[PDB]
């Protein structure tokens, strides 16, 4: 009942990427530029259908440099981690929160299994806990 | 002689991103945060090994909003797109430079066969023309 670190997640589908700068509420620990990826199971959800077990998004932040007002992207920070499993994850809605510190397999930053993650994505219960929206 | 409308590039590799902001000497006409795409081909050159003809580099520029510490995507502003073909693009280094405003396949930007894209492009042509490095 640990979520799988997802290899590979850089080849998958880029849903959407967002900025968060220094004083946001949520600067520790997401300060930087996210990136948000969906394997071909986590698109079935995005599209509007149900989220099959084995769907898979990451929450891919850099930390950037800020140069001439360009923000340009440094090192990897972590990504966080949602794995799809009904059985497997139904303490936390049928997801499996995880963090990697700077990408790492072997850096896991959950230690409360996951309730603090799903405290603030329970607000989302009607997109099915997923914050991110499909845009062209 | 016409780069091709690079349909379906947002499934594609999601090489890298880039937020150029106010101030920023290329503001005008780049202002916005931007997100390079690469096919199956053009991740060939990119690694290191050569661009095979039929390679592609998409340059996705979005308009973004201020939102409490955040920069949120808007509208998509345009794509540029860089078509490998060393014969037919011969006289811009073997890649064709085209834009799409708002991405539409309709409303083709470049004027001149691309030889102002390619007149900046040129001082990469130890990295192919490429200005973009795969980063993990
Ligand atoms: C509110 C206080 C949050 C907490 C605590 C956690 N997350 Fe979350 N997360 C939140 C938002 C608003 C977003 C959307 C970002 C965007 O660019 O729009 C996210 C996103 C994710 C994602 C991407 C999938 C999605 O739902 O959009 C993942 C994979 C993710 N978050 C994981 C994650 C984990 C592992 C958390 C506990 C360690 C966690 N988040 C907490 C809001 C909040
Ligand atoms: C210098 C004054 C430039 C001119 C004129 C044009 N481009 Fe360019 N391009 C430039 C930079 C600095 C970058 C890198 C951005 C980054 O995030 O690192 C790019 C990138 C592209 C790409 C992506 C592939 C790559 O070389 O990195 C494409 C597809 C691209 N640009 C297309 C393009 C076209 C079509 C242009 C004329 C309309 C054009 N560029 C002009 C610098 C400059
Ligand atoms: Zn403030
Ligand atoms: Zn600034």
Chains 1, 2 share one sequence.
Not at 124 to 136: A, G, H, I, N, P
Request: proline residues 4%; aromatic residues 12%.
């Amino acid at each position: 009942t640990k979520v799988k670190y997802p290899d590979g997640f850089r080849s998958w589908y880029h849903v959407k990427s967002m900025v968060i700068q220094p004083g946001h509420p949520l600067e520790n620990p997401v300060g930087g530029i996210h990136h948000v990826y969906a394997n071909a199971e986590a698109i079935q959800g995005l599209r509007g259908g149900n989220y099959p077990d084995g769907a898979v998004l990451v929450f891919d932040l850099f930390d950037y440099q800020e140069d001439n007002h360009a923000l340009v992207e440094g090192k990897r920070k972590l990504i966080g981690v949602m794995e799809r499993d009904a059985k497997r994850f139904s303490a936390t809605g049928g997801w499996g929160y995880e963090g990697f510190g700077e990408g790492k397999p072997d850096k896991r930053l959950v230690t409360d299994g996951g309730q603090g993650c799903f405290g603030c994505h329970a607000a989302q219960k009607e997109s099915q806990y997923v914050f991110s929206r499909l845009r062209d």
